[PDB]
Amino acid sequence: VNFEEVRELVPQKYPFLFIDKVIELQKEARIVCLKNISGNEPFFAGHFPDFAIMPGVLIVEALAQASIILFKKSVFLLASANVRFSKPVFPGDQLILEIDIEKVISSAAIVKGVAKVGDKVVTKATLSFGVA
Amino acid sequence: VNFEEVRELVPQKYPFLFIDKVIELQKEARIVCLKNISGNEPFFAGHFPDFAIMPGVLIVEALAQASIILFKKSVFLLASANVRFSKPVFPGDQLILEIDIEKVISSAAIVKGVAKVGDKVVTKATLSFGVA
Amino acid sequence: VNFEEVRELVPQKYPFLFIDKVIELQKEARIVCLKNISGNEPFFAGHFPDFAIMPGVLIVEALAQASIILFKKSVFLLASANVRFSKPVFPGDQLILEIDIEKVISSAAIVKGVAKVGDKVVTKATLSFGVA
Amino acid sequence: VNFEEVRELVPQKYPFLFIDKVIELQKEARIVCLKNISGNEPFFAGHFPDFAIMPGVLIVEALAQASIILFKKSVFLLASANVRFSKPVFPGDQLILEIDIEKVISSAAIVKGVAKVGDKVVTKATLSFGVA
Amino acid sequence: VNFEEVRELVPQKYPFLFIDKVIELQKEARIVCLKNISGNEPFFAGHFPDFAIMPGVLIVEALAQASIILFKKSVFLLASANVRFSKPVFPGDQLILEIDIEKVISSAAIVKGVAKVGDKVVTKATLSFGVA
Amino acid sequence: VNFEEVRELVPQKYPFLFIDKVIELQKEARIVCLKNISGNEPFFAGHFPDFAIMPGVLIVEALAQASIILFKKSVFLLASANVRFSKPVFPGDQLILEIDIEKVISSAAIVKGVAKVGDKVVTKATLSFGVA
């Protein structure tokens, strides 16, 4: 799934769309997405002026947007997140977002997310969603 | 503490600085910050085009920045967050960010954060920080 | 009137829409609007780098946009403005915009506007509009 | 006076600096400035989506910034403005800003401003400043 | 051809639309376009912080967009460019873009472009396009 | 060479810095740089609204910035470019920029640049620089 298709699946748009493509998809099971980290993204100017580092909260949003793609190919709002920010992410990194469904029902979904650069884990989260 | 002082305390800057002022401060104990939610903030164009709603992850970042102000008046990176997104936040809302210290040591800090509009709770989190 | 409705009433959009909500409305008479002032608004980076202060001309535009909301719930272009900038406005302020109609005709309208923070008057203006 | 010098004279910066160069200067008397109107300026996206027209309030700010250049080559805040918006200004226009000093004292200045495209007058204003 | 018409002819939009108006048009032969250079354009903040100068590559894009207008009034992608950057372009300059068709076929077009400030040549290019 | 070092070598900054890291460097000979292509970069909103594709002219600028890094680790302005845009580049692509020096003298440098995604060539250029 290329960026043009991702844009239509994900309701978020610039400057708050943090998926570039889908790399792997097992419906009702798992998705793997890619987000290129570019020094030319607007949030880096503010985080931080002296040192560009990807904000952990935006890794969480990327994981949530990957989950939404997984849901839709099988209005979702993040209902909760339990996240550990293990390692920092920099311009030049290719961020890999892996989502595994834990449980889905008509009104909610609970997933486990792992963010990786290469195959070093940089972020792990459990996310829950509601069907607003 | 007005915006000009907040700007110097918090290393984040536009478009990733999400505190406007400090309202209440008990050093080593508690801080209460204010973030005005304005429809003229850049992230609303992307979240969402059809319906401007504050991203929950940016409420988390606001809570984290309030904590950093509390730490400094007593390089902090979010190390973990356990957050429940209870209620949505809209342009026109005055977001109140209340941080209570749980435990601080030379190398880490753990806090409980509550975000409110009026005195309706919209977000609750436990946050941990490292001293990078 | 919430932001979503304001967005559809006012033809201006980001980064030039300076109303968040309507607080009070007496058709053909008076409107009271709210604009949250946020340090995360794009114009503050340029006015001024050393010290964020709301440009008076953008308070005028906010007053004009409030007037347009009042007109429409009863293409308007600012035709004239006679304005006194009394007191400065800062990130964290809730700007209250009060418009009273002086005279409306098929082709023009003349209003008196008052901008307040709390109930301290920060700006007073007489505005006229044409029906372009 | 080219843009690089204008940038240092005027405390405003992007996206709120609305002078490109100084064309004519008689100290303590008169200044003539130029502002190119470009469709690639950020405010046009919001004013208006369907039809790009320069906001009159930003012509006022341009006139005020020209005045500040005149003052400095002989912290100024707009204290008042009495302005008539005669004719619209579009991308592609070269906006000419002519400022004539009415009266200056240690603490205030009052000027008359005329904005022109070609030699058609598009805006006329009387402006006053304080020495904040 | 004013900006509103240019916007509909050219598929590029803010912040990548670099034509303001069409000044002269001989279909299947020649076009002359105008791009105002404004210090309030977003790319100047990055090129360069210490000294605003128009990037030569964006003059090339302006020449390419002028060519596309000429094509359409008689999806084009730049296929090649052979360009000499003779003289620098600054905020305050009115950039004149002159395109002469060399050869057009159903699937490609080759043009010669000259960019001028006043009638000093600042850029000369040969451009080719494909019909993607 | 990571992004933080690239930022100090290259005078361009956001939104006109198009290198993320240096991958390979043989002084006075060759450099290989990486630019992540992210759908969250500001130029994609304008090129094109319906379909995000990297502008070829910005690949040229990326090649020029890679060359400048090579020069400095051994004020450069693009003096000329002879470029063939072979294949399109999309959000999600990792753009590889390979520069080989042809000839350097005290006042000028001539290089050959190749841009690749994977090891498919997307752009080839000959660039010349002056020492402004």
Q: What is the dihedral of CA D11, D13, D16, D22, to 10 degrees?
A: 70
Task: Say if A115 is an interface residue toward chain B (CB within 8 Å).
Answer: no
Q: Smallest Cβ distance to C11: which of D14, D16, D48? A: D48
Instruction: Identify whether the C-beta of residue C128 lies closer than 8 Å to the C-beta of residue C67.
Output: no
At a CB cut-off of 8 Å and minimum separation 6, what does C122 contact?
A: C59, C85, C86, C87, C88, C89, C95, C115, C116
Domain ranges of chain B: 3-130
Substitution target in A1, A3, A8 with the highest count of F β-carbons within 10 Å is A3
Of C53, C79, C84, the CB nearest to D85: C79
Q: Which residues of E touch F12 (CB under 8 A)?
A: 46-48
Look at E14 and D42 and tell me if their CB atoms are within 8 Å. yes
Chain A contact for B14, CB < 8 A? yes
Deposited resolution, Å: 1.8
Three-state secondary structure string covering chain D? CCHHHHHHHCCCCCCCCCCCEEEEEECCCEEEEEEECCCCCHHHHHCCCCCCCCCHHHHHHHHHHHHHHHHHCCCEEEEEEEEEECCCCCCCCEEEEEEEEEEEECCEEEEEEEEEECCEEEEEEEEEEEEC
Query: Nearest residue of D to residue E38 by CA position?
Result: D36
Residue E120 burial (CB < 10 Å; 0-12/13-18/19+)? exposed
D-chain CB neighbours of E35 within 8 Å are: 38
**CB–CB of D66/D33 below 8 Å?**
yes
Distance CA D23, CA D1 (A): 7
3-class secondary structure, C2: coil
Q: Is B125 on the interface with C (CB under 8 A)?
A: no
Chains within contact range of chain A (3+ C-beta pairs < 8 Å): B, F
Let me know if D111 is a catalytic residue. Answer: no
The shortest C-alpha distance from A48 to chain B (Å) reads 6
Q: Residues C33, C23: contact at Cβ < 8 Å?
A: yes
Q: Which CATH number fits domain A3-130: 3.40.50.10490, 3.40.50.970, 3.10.450.710, 3.10.129.10?
A: 3.10.129.10
**Is A17 an 8 Å CB contact of chain F?**
yes
For residue F31 the two structure tokens come to 């450099």
Cβ separation of B19 and C3 shorter than 8 Å? no
Question: Residue C5's closest CA among C19, C24, C26?
Answer: C19
Q: b/e per residue, B1-22, with b = 16+ CB within 10 A? A: bebeebbebbbbbbbbbbbbbb
Annotated active-site residue in D21, D47, D73, D124: D47
Contact D88 C82 (CB under 8 A): no
Q: Any chain E CB within 8 A of the CB of D114? A: no
User: Comparing C-alpha atoms, which of E129, E68, E128, E131 is closest to residue E97?
Assistant: E68
Residue A31 touches partner B, C-beta closer than 8 Å = no
**Distance from the E14 Cα atom to the nearest Cα atom in chain D, whole angstroms:** 6
Closest residue of chain E to F42, computed from CA coordinates = E15
| Residue F44 forms contact with A (CB below 8 Å) | yes
Chain E residues touching residue D15 (CB < 8 angstroms):
40, 42
Tokens 């919209």 correspond to: B122
Chain C neighbours (≥3 Cβ pairs under 8 A) are B, D
String of b and e for E21-51 (b: at least 16 CB within 10 Å)? bbeeeeeeeebbbbbbbbbbbbbbbbbbeee
Identify which of B104, B57, B109 has the alpha carbon closest to the alpha carbon of residue B83.
Answer: B57
Q: Determine the distance in angstroms separating the CA of B119 from the nearest CA of chain C, rounded to an integer.
A: 17
Elucidation method: X-ray
d(CA D11, CA F70): 36
**Are the CB atoms for D124 and D114 separated by under 8 Å?**
yes
d(CA F78, CA C123): 50
What is d(CA F89, CA F34) in angstroms, rounded to the nearest whole number? 13
**Residue type present at position B70:** L
Pairwise CB contact (< 8 Å): D88 & C77: yes
- Catalytic residue list of E: 47
Q: Are the beta carbons of D35 and D18 closer than 8 angstroms?
A: yes
β-partners of residue C102 are none
Please indicate whether chains C and B are in contact, defined as at least 3 beta carbon pairs under 8 Å.
yes
Token digits for E44?
């100047």
8 Å CB contact of B91 and C20: yes
CA geometry: angle at B24 spanning B18 and B28, to 5°?
95
Pure H helices in chain A:
3-9, 56-72
- Chain E environment of D14 (Cβ under 8 Å): 39-40, 42, 44-45
Sheet containing strand A30-36, strands side by side: A21-26, A30-36, A94-105, A108-117, A120-131, A76-85, B76-85, B120-131, B108-117, B94-105, B30-36, B21-26
Using a 10 angstrom Cβ sphere, with 0-12 exposed, 13-18 middle and 19 or more buried, the burial of residue E70 is: buried
Instruction: Put residue A39 in one of left, alpha, beta given phi > 0 → left and psi -120 to 50 → alpha.
Output: alpha
The nearest CA of chain C is from the CA of D36 a distance in Å of 18
Cis peptide preceding A51, ω within 30 of 0: no
Q: Is A8 on the interface with F (CB under 8 A)?
A: no
Cβ separation of A78 and B84 shorter than 8 Å?
no
Ramachandran quadrant class, C118 (left: phi over 0; alpha: psi -120 to 50; beta: rest): left
